[PDB]
Structure formats: structure tokens, C-alpha cells
Paper text:
The two rings of Imatinib modeled within the L-Histidine binding pocket are well-resolved. The remainder of Imatinib extends to the AdoMet binding site resulting in a lack of difference density representing those three heterocycles. The pyridine ring sits within the imidazole binding subsite and forms π-π interactions with Tyr206 and eleven close (shorter than 4.0 Å) van der Waals interactions with the surrounding hydrophobic residues. In addition, the nitrogen atom of the pyridine ring forms a hydrogen bond with the ordered water molecule analogous to the imidazole-water interaction observed in the L-Histidine derivative structures. The pyrimidine ring forms only three van der Waals interactions and three hydrogen bonded interactions with two ordered water molecules and the side chain of Thr163. The pyridine-pyrimidine rings of Imatinib are positioned in the histidine binding pocket by an extensive network of interactions. Superimposing the Imatinib complex with the M. smegmatis EgtD-L-Histidine complex illustrates distinct modes of binding site engagement. Where L-Histidine interacts with EgtD primarily through polar interactions, Imatinib interacts through almost exclusively van der Waals interactions. Based on these results, it is intriguing to consider that M. tb EgtD is a biological target for Imatinib and that inhibition of EGT production during an infection is the reason for the observed drug synergy.
Author numbering: 1 to 321
């Protein structure tokens, strides 16, 4: 099938987004950064290692559900088009593409992400593995370009890995409302959500003893150093995984070991870290089964299927427009 890539992000979209977030984030109290910047080449390779850590259950848990329920997803949604809010690189991507193809229904694939070079590689890869599927990759962001996702056919939107968990309730509901807005009656959404559980298990999942997640978090300081001429003493910042009991969410912090004076060159900004000051780099909200259905209902979608893994660690929702 023919490959297409439509690019809606300017060449300096990423850099200009990084200046904004760093300028604003390092002047908040407490200092905070979007989890958007962990993923340069190094961080992406670190995340790949994280998914194979025994402590990080979500990847395997979601995969377990998908290995069992992918056929039912295909037959219940009846989609001919797979829209992935992601890079299209996971084996989970293929599991759903196989399930739709097995029904003789796989007609189009739409990967949607911000890295045009990632989408181009995904599209070439799906093109050799799935004869007869048109691949329409869309380079855009959630805030502006959900409308640029092609229309027509019966579309199954996919958003896995409890990545919606990286949005706080306010921004999370806006995203779901906007996503439901571009969905057509008959379209469906498959959404993965990590579930609330034993706190010690959750903290361990975000601070493996080998420190891969620690390096992954500290990697954000190198990215700021390299891209905006900052002088973060990366080794003087400790990764700290916190369980927020009141908000029921995991929080990734970076703790300054001693007073730090950090100058971000490209921004003409100097910020100060008190000794023991912590900066928030990510939130990872954990969900309750009932609450996910209410959130989809609040945005205008109707959950028709809910699945957990065998241990009840992770949940998958199939909601219809
Ligand atoms: N996308 C996503 N969703 C949930 C958790 C995570 C995550 C972050 C940082 C380290 N390990 C896992 N990423």
C-alpha cells in the first residue's frame, strides 16, 4: 500500500516548545517540567530498557491483555482504520493490526506523533509487513492537529501504556473532549490505564534498583544542557519516586544535593535550587476502573468493554463515539 506522511509541525516546533517549557517551568514554585522532553535518542533507548524491567509491570500487563483481547477489540469495534496516538513501533501496534487484518478489515493505518522521522520509519516498516494497507502518517501534536487525522471509514483510535496518566485531571479531560470531538459516530477509542494498587509496588516500578529509571529522569537535565546551553550539574541531582496518596498518582522528582546555581544560556535565565530542593519532572496518574468510564462519559464516549490483566494491575477500555 501507498505511504503518506503529512507534516504540520515547523522545523523549530520542538526547539521552540522546549524554550517555552523550560523558561516557564524553572520559574514555577515548585519548579516543574513536562514529561515531554525525556525522549531524545538516549532517553528513548532508556525507556526501552525500562519496559523490560521486572519492576515495570505496565508494559507486560497491557501486552497480556492485548494478546488475549485483540480479536474481541477488532470484532467489537468493526474498524477498518487503525489510528495510533503514538509512534507505531510497539509489538502492541502489530497485535491490533493483525487482529483487524485477520478479520479481512485492515484497510488503513494512521500513526500520529511529533517526530516526523519516527513516523517515516514506522510507515516504511508497516508497508513491508502489511501488503494492502494504506499508511497515512500525520506529524502533529494533540493541542492543534487532531483534526488533521484523516476521516472516513470506521476508525479505532488507540492510546496505550497509561500515557493519558501523564496528564493531570484538567488537561486530561480537555484532551479527551478534543479527541471525542474529532471522532465520528461509530468510531471507537482503545485506552490503556494503569490501576491504583499497593503503593510500595508503584514506587518500585518508578525507581528500579539498577537506576535505569533514575538515569532516564536525570536524562532531562542533559537535554536541557545540550539544547539550551545550560550548566546543570547532572550528577548533583537525585531521582526520587513519590506516591501522591491524595491525588493517587506517581510523581517523578529530581532532588538537588546542595545549593545549585543553574544558568540556561539560550534563555538568559538564572535559577537557584535550595539544598534539597525537588523539581517535578513527571506525574503518572493511577486510575480506578469506575473512574475511567466516568471520564470517557464526561467527554462524550461510551465505554463498551473494560479489561484488566490477571492480577488486576492494568486496565484497557474500549469506548465508542
Ligand atoms: N508513558 C508512561 N506512562 C506511564 C509511566 C511512564 C514512565 C515514566 C518514567 C519511567 N517509567 C515509566 N511512562
Amino acid at each position: 500500500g501507498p505511504v503518506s506522511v503529512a507534516n504540520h509541525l515547523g522545523e523549530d516546533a520542538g526547539h521552540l516548545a522546549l524554550r517555552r517549557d523550560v523558561y516557564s517551568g524553572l520559574q514555577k514554585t515548585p519548579k516543574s517540567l513536562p514529561p515531554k522532553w525525556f525522549y531524545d535518542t538516549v532517553g528513548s533507548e532508556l525507556f526501552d530498557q525500562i519496559t523490560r524491567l521486572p519492576e515495570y509491570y505496565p508494559t507486560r500487563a497491557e501486552a497480556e491483555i492485548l494478546r488475549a483481547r485483540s480479536a474481541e477489540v477488532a470484532s467489537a469495534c468493526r474498524a477498518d482504520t487503525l489510528v495510533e496516538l503514538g509512534s507505531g513501533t510497539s509489538e502492541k501496534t502489530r497485535m491490533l493490526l493483525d487482529a483487524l487484518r485477520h478479520r479481512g478489515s485492515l484497510r488503513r493505518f494512521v500513526p500520529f506523533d511529533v517526530d516526523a522521522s519516527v513516523l517515516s520509519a514506522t510507515a516504511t516498516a508497516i508497508q513491508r509487513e502489511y501488503s494492502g494497507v494504506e499508511i497515512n502518517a500525520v506529524c502533529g501534536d494533540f493541542e492543534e492537529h487532531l483534526t488533521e487525522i484523516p476521516r472516513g471509514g470506521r476508525r479505532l483510535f488507540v492510546f496505550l501504556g497509561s500515557t493519558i496518566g501523564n496528564l493531570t485531571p484538567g488537561p486530561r479531560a480537555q484532551f479527551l473532549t478534543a479527541l471525542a470531538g474529532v471522532m465520528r459516530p461509530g468510531d471507537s477509542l482503545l485506552l490503556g490505564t494503569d490501576l491504583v494498587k499497593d503503593a510500595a509496588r508503584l514506587v518500585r516500578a518508578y525507581d528500579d534498583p539498577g537506576g535505569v529509571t533514575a538515569q532516564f529522569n536525570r536524562n532531562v537535565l542533559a537535554v536541557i544542557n545540550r539544547e539550551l546551553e545550560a550548566d546543570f550539574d547532572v550528577d548533583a541531582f537525585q531521582h526520587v519516586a513519590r506516591w501522591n496518596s491524595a491525588e493517587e498518582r506517581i510523581e517523578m522528582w529530581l532532588r538537588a544535593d546542595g545549593r545549585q546555581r543553574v544558568r540556561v544560556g539560550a534563555l538568559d535565565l538564572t535559577v537557584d535550587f535550595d539544598a534539597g530542593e525537588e523539581m517535578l519532572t513527571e506525574v503518572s496518574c493511577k486510575f480506578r476502573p469506575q473512574a475511567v468510564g466516568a471520564e470517557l462519559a464526561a467527554a462524550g464516549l461510551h465505554r463498551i468493554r473494560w479489561w484488566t490483566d490477571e492480577a488486576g494491575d492494568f486496565g484497557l477500555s474500549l469506548a465508542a463515539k
